[PDB]
Write an enzyme that holds these catalytic residues in place. Structure first.
Site, PDB file in Angstrom:
ATOM      1  N   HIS A  57      83.891  62.474 -46.915  1.00  0.00           N
ATOM      2  CA  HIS A  57      83.544  61.389 -45.973  1.00  0.00           C
ATOM      3  C   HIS A  57      82.089  60.978 -46.039  1.00  0.00           C
ATOM      4  O   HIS A  57      81.705  59.945 -45.497  1.00  0.00           O
ATOM      5  CB  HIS A  57      83.997  61.733 -44.548  1.00  0.00           C
ATOM      6  N   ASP A  68      88.899  66.711 -47.458  1.00  0.00           N
ATOM      7  CA  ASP A  68      87.595  66.074 -47.228  1.00  0.00           C
ATOM      8  C   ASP A  68      86.557  66.813 -48.047  1.00  0.00           C
ATOM      9  O   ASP A  68      85.454  67.089 -47.566  1.00  0.00           O
ATOM     10  CB  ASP A  68      87.230  66.101 -45.739  1.00  0.00           C
ATOM     11  N   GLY A  88      75.062  64.537 -39.422  1.00  0.00           N
ATOM     12  CA  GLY A  88      74.231  64.631 -40.615  1.00  0.00           C
ATOM     13  C   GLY A  88      74.215  66.007 -41.253  1.00  0.00           C
ATOM     14  O   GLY A  88      73.554  66.202 -42.272  1.00  0.00           O
ATOM     15  N   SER A  95      77.101  67.884 -42.097  1.00  0.00           N
ATOM     16  CA  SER A  95      78.312  68.183 -42.865  1.00  0.00           C
ATOM     17  C   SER A  95      77.918  68.539 -44.297  1.00  0.00           C
ATOM     18  O   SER A  95      76.853  68.138 -44.788  1.00  0.00           O
ATOM     19  CB  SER A  95      79.306  67.017 -42.855  1.00  0.00           C
TER      20      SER A  95
END
Ligand SMILES: C=C[C@@H]1C[C@]1(NC(=O)[C@@H]1C[C@@H]2CN1C(=O)[C@H](C(C)(C)C)NC(=O)O[C@@H]1C[C@H]1CCCCCc1nc3ccc(OC)cc3nc1O2)C(=O)NS(=O)(=O)C1CC1
Ligand SMILES: [Zn+2]
Length: 190
Positions: A68, A92, A148, A150
């Site tokens: 993502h 993801d 911010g 991830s």
């Protein structure tokens, strides 16, 4: 454009701290050429696209990050843009070959539940593992606080990677638990 390494989170001493290593304009040129000359250091990289910044974690020779954030992008490198080795939307999850100069975190073999989440800010938050892919936070924060971050690692007490941070379980815009991508899933992918 390519995903460009804009920094690193430092874990190699007592403190955790982010060293930014590149400017916005520098990031733009290097996103555009896909050629990155900057030396690579450590396990957790700070990465960014034209519009988003996030983290990237090296585990077993592969730099891991969230789909993502990175989408299908190449990564800017010394020999030019590199296509993803690994890309799994459901998970993801995306991986490239760990860049020359990077270090991998050793995978956790300890089964310890007192986990730690390294944010973009280089804060280290205790997380208490609550499942196969979930940890509750001891101290809850706003969602903005974790945004911010991830692609960053969840660590056992011995400094090993347990998973990669992915998403925040949010009630009233307050994260009370964190959703991660356990190392075991990375090895299923590899
Ligand atoms: C706030 C810190 C948080 C770590 C961060 N992650 C997100 O914001 C994720 C991305 C997105 C929504 N996220 C969330 O965390 C949400 C949110 C409402 C935003 C709090 N939480 C959430 O769903 O909780 C639900 C229980 C879990 C259900 C499971 C969620 C599924 C996860 C997920 N998977 C995919 C797979 C493929 C996709 O393809 C396009 C897109 C996806 N998007 C996803 O969620 C982050 O900091 N990002 S970032 O650094 O700013 C960015 C630059 C990279
Ligand atoms: Zn461990």
């Amino acid at each position: 454009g390519s995903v460009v390494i804009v920094g690193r989170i430092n874990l190699s001493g007592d403190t955790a701290y982010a060293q930014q290593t590149r400017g916005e304009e520098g990031c733009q040129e290097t996103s555009q050429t896909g050629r990155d000359k900057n030396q690579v250091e450590g396990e957790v990289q700070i990465v960014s696209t034209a519009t988003q910044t996030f983290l990237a974690t090296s585990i077993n020779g592969v730099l891991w990050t969230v789909y993502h954030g990175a989408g299908t992008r190449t990564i800017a490198s010394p020999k030019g843009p590199v296509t993803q080795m690994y890309t799994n939307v459901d998970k993801d999850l995306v991986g490239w070959q760990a860049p020359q100069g990077s270090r991998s975190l050793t995978p956790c073999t300890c089964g310890s539940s007192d986990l730690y989440l390294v944010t973009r800010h280089a804060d280290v938050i205790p997380v208490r593992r609550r499942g196969d892919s979930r940890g509750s936070l001891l101290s809850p924060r706003p969602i903005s606080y974790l945004k911010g971050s991830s692609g960053g690692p969840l660590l056992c007490p011995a400094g090993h990677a347990v998973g990669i941070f992915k998403a925040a379980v949010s009630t009233r815009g307050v994260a009370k638990a964190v959703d991660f991508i356990p190392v075991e899933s990375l090895e299923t992918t590899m």
